Short mmCIF file of C-alpha atoms and ligand atoms in Angstrom, two decimals:
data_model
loop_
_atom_site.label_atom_id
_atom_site.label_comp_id
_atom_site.label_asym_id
_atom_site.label_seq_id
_atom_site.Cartn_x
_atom_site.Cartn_y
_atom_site.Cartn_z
CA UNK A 1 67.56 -20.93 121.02
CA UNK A 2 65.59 -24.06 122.50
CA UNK A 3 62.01 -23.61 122.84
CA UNK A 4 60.46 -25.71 126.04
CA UNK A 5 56.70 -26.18 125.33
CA UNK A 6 55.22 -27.98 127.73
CA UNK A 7 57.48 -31.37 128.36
CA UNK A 8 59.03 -30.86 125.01
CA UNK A 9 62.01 -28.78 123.95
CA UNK A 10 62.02 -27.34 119.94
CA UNK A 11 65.07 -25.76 118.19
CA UNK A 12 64.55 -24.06 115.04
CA UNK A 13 67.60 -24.77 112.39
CA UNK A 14 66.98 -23.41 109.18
CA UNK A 15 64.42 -20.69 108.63
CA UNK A 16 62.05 -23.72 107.54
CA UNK A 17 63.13 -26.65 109.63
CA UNK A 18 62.79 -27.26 113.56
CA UNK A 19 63.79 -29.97 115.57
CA UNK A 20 61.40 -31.46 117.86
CA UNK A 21 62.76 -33.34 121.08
CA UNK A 22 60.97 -35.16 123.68
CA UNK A 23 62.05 -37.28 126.51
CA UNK A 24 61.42 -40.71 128.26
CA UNK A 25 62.50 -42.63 131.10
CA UNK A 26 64.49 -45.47 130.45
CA UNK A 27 65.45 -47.60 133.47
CA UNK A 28 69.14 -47.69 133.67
CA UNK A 29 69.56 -44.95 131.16
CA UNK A 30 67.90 -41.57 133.07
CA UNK A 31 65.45 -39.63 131.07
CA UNK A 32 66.63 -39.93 127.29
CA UNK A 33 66.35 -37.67 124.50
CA UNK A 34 64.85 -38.34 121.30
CA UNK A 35 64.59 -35.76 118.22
CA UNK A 36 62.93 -35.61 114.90
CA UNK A 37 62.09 -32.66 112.90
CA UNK A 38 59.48 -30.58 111.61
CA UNK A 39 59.69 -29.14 107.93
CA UNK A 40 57.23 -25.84 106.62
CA UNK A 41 56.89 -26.62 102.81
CA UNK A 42 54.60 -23.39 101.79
CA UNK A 43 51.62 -23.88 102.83
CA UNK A 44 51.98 -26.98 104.93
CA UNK A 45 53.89 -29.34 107.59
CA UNK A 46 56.04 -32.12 107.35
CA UNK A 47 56.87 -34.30 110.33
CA UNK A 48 59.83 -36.54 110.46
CA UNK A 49 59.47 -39.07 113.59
CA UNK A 50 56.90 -38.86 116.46
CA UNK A 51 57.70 -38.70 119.76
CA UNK A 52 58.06 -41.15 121.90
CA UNK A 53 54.44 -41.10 123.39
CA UNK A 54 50.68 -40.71 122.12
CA UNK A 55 50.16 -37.58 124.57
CA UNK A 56 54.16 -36.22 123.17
CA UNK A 57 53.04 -36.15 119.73
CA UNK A 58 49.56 -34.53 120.38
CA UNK A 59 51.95 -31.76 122.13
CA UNK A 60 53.87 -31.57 118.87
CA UNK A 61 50.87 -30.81 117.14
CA UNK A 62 49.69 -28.32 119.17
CA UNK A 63 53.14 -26.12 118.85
CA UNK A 64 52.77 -26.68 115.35
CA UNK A 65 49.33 -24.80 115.39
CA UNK A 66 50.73 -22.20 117.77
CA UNK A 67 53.82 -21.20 115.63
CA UNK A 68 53.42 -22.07 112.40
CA UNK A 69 49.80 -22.73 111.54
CA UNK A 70 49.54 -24.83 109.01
CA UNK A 71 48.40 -28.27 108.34
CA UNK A 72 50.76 -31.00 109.00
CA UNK A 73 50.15 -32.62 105.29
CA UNK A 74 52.21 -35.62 106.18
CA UNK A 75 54.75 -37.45 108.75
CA UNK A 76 57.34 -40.40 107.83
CA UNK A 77 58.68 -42.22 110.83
CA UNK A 78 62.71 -43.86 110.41
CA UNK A 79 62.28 -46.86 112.31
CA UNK A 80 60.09 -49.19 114.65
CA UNK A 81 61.17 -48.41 117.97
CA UNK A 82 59.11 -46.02 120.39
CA UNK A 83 61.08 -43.08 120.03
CA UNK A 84 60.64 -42.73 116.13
CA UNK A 85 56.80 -44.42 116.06
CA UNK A 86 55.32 -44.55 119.44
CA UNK A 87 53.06 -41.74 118.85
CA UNK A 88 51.28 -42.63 115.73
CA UNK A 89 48.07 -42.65 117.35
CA UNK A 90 47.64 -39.26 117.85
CA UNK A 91 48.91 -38.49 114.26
CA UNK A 92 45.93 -40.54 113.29
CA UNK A 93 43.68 -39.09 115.27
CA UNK A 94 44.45 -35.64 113.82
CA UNK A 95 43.92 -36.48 110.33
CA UNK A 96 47.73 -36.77 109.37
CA UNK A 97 48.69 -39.26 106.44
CA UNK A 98 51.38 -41.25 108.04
CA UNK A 99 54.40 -43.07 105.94
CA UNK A 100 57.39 -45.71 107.21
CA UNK A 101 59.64 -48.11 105.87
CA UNK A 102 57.28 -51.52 104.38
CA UNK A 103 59.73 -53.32 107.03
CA UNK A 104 58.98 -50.68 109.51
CA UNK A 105 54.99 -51.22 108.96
CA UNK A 106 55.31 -54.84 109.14
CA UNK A 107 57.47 -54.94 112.47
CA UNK A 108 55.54 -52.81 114.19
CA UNK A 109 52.83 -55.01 115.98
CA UNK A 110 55.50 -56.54 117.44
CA UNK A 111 57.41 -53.79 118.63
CA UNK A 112 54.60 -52.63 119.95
CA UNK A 113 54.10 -50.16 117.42
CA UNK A 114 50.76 -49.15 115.50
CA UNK A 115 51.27 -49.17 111.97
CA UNK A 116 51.39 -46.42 109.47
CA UNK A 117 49.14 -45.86 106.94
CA UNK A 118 51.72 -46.57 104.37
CA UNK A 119 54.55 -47.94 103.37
CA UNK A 120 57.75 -46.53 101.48
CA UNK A 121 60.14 -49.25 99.27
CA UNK A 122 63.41 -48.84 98.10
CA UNK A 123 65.22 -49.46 95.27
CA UNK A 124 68.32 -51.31 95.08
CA UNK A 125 70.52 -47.95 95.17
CA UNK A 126 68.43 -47.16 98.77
CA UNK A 127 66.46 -44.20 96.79
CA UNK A 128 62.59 -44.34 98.11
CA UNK A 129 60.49 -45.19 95.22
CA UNK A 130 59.13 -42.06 94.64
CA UNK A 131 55.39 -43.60 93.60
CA UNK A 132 55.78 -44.47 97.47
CA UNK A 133 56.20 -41.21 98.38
CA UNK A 134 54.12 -38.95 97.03
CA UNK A 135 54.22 -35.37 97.84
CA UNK A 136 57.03 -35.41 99.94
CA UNK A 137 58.43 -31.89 98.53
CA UNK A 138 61.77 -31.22 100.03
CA UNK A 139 62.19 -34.42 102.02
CA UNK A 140 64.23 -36.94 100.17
CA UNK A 141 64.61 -40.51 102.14
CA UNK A 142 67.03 -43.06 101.75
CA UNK A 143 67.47 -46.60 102.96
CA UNK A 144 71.23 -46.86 104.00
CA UNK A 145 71.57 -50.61 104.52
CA UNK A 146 71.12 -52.61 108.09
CA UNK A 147 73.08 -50.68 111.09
CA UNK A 148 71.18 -49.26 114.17
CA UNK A 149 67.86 -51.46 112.84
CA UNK A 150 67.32 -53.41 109.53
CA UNK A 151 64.56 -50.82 108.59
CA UNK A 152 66.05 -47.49 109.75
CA UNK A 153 65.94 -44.67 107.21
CA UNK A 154 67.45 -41.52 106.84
CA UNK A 155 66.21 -37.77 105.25
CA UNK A 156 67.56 -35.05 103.32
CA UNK A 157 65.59 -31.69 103.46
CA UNK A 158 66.11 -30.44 99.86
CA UNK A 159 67.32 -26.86 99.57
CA UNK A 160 69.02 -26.77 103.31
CA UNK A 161 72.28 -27.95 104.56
CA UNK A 162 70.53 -30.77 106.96
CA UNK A 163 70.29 -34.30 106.94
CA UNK A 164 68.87 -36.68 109.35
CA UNK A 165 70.49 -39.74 110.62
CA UNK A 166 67.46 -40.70 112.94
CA UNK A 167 69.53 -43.74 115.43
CA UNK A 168 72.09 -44.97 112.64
CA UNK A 169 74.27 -41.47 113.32
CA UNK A 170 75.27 -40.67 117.00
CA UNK A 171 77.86 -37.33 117.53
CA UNK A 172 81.59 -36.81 117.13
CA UNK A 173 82.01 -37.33 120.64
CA UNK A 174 79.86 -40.57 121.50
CA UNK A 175 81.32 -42.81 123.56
CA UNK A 176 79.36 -46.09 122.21
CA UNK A 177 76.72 -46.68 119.56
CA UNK A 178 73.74 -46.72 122.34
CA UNK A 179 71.34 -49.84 121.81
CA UNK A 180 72.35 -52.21 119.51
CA UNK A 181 69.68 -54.99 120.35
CA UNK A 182 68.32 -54.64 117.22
CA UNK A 183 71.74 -53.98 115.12
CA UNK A 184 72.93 -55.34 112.31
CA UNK A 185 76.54 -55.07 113.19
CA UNK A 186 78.05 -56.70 110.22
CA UNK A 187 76.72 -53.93 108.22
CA UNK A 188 76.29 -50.93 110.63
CA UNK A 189 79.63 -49.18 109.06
CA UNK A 190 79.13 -49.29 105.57
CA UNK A 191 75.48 -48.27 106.41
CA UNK A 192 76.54 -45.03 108.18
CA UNK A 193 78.91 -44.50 105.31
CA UNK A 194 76.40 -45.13 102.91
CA UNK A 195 73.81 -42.08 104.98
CA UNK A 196 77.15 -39.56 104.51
CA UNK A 197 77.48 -40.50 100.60
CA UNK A 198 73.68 -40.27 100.02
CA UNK A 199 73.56 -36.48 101.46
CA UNK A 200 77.24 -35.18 100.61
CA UNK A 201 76.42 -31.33 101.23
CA UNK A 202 74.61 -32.01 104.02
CA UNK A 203 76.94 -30.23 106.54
CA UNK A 204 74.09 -30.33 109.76
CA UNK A 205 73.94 -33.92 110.81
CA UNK A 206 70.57 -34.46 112.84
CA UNK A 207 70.35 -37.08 114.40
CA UNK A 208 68.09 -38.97 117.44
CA UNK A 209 70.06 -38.60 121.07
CA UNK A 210 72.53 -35.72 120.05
CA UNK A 211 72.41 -31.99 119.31
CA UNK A 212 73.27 -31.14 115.73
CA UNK A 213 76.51 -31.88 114.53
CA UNK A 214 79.07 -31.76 112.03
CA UNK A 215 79.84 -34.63 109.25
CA UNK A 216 82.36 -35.63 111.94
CA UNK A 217 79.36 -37.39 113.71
CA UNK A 218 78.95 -39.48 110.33
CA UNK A 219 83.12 -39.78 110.05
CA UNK A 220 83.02 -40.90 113.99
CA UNK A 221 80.12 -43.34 113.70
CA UNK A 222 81.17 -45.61 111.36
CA UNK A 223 84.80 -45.54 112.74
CA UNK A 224 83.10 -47.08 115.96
CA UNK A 225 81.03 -49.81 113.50
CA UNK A 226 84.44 -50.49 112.28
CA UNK A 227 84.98 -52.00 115.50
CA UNK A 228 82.10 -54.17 115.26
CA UNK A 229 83.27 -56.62 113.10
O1 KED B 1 65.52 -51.09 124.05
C1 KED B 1 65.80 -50.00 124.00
C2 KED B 1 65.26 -49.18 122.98
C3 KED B 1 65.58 -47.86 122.94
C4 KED B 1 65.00 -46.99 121.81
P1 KED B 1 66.22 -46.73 120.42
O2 KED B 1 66.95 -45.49 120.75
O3 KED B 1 67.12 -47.96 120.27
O4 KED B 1 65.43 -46.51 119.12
C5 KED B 1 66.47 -47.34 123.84
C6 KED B 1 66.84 -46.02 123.82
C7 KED B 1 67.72 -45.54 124.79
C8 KED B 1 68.21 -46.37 125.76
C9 KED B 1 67.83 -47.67 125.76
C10 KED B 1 66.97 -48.19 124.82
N1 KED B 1 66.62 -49.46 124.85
ZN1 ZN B 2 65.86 -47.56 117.60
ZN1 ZN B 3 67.60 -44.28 119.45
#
């Protein structure tokens, strides 16, 4: 089933959907997983996430061109941490119209980050504007509230069973809700909550460290942000 290309691992999950994993080390935390997904609408490519390096996401690109060959029309990115953004250089540099969070873009020099080249809102519901968003096809994001970041945001893919949690939504089995230095832990449950209610026949939960999952993962994480208050 997994796919290792080069440094990278890909796992196809729906006949139009793949999800892309790459890998950094983290001192103190080994060599960590991070996964986003790629999305064949017709005649093009949709990205959801980098990964976490320049040289990962050119990688990316090029298994996109091997196996599916098409152009990658667009990639949104679910928050401002490496793993999700670090490689938006190298989208740039192949042409690729690049989308985040307004909170995301504005973060980002400070993360470290390089901007994309625009930026979603949401309105008060957590529905993306959808003049924000233009030809998105399948790909339906929503803002769940504050919980793994203040900007993170989440993705339906239209016509499948999958939705992405990106770092808000860790497996049924996690043991802890990974790096909260940038949580909003006040909120973090409701938030997770809020993801499951957003996507309720979504029964593959993607998500950024973890394989695919059950709606358990959703059920479990926000039973551990219960525990944060
Ligand atoms: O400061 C951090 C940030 C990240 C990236 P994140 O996954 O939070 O987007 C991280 C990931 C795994 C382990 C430790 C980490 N420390
Ligand atoms: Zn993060
Ligand atoms: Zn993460």
């Amino acid at each position: 089933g997994d796919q290792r290309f080069g440094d990278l691992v890909f796992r196809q999950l729906a006949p139009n959907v793949w999800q892309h994993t790459s890998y950094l080390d983290m001192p103190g935390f080994g060599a960590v997983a991070s996964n986003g997904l790629i999305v064949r609408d017709g005649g093009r490519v949709l990205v959801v996430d980098t990964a976490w390096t320049d040289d990962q996401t050119a990688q990316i690109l090029n298994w996109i061109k091997q196996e599916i060959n098409l152009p990658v029309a667009l990639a949104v990115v679910t928050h401002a941490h490496q793993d999700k953004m670090g490689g938006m250089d190298a989208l740039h540099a192949a042409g690729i119209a690049t989308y985040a969070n307004a909170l995301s873009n504005q973060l980002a020099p400070q993360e470290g980050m390089v901007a994309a080249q625009h930026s979603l809102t949401f309105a008060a519901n957590g529905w993306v504007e959808p003049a924000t968003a233009p030809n998105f096809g399948p790909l339906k994001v929503f803002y769940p509230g504050p919980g793994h970041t203040s900007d993170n945001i989440t993705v339906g893919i239209d016509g499948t069973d999958i939705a992405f949690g990106g770092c808000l939504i860790k497996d049924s089995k996690a043991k802890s809700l990974g790096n909260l230095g940038d949580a909003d832990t006040e909120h973090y449950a409701a938030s997770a909550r809020a993801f499951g209610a957003a996507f309720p026949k979504a029964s593959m939960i993607v998500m950024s460290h973890s394989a695919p999952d059950s709606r358990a993962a959703i059920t479990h994480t926000a039973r551990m942000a219960d525990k944060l208050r």
